[PDB]
Amino acid sequence: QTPYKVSISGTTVILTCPQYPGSEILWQHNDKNIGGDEDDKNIGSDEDHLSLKEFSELEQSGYYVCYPRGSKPEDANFYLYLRARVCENCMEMDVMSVATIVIVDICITGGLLLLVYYWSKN
Amino acid sequence: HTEKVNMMSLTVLGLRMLFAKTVAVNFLLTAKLFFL
């Protein structure tokens, strides 16, 4: 019932599977088992997190299913579809957040202007 | 590549804010320089 938590931070995607508490969790991509491969170190399954570094959208996307230790890849019926961009030093916001930061700049500039004028007046 | 386009839009906004701040401070400075 608990959905996965996907955090895309630059050239790095983090997948967390919080439904199974504290059990050893292994990961599957398009019915291919990945995580702790001892090679191709850009993918790693430390703790609950699949940390995919340099996430190639054409080849590292698709299905992703976690399963606890002692549970088969074929009897876990809670799959995640992952499809994301890998733009370097690149994040996502709408007009709201840039309007928020420019409004914040307006507010601190006007407050500093009024405060400096009032302090120099007194 | 819409990411570079939107970054260009954001730094256009930043340069426009910089222009507004320097226009305001330079108007204030010339008002003082004709205000003794």
Binding site: A99, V102, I106 | S9, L10, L13, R16
Partner: peptide, 27 residues
């Protein structure tokens, strides 16, 4: 298409409070 309109709205806000000051000081 939106962010530049926010900057122009901010300059319009400055212009309209300046014009309000001019109107209050011209009477």
């Amino acid at each position: 298409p939106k962010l530049c309109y926010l900057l122009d709205g901010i300059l319009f806000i400055y212009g309209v409070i300046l014009t309000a000051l001019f109107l209050r000081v011209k009477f």
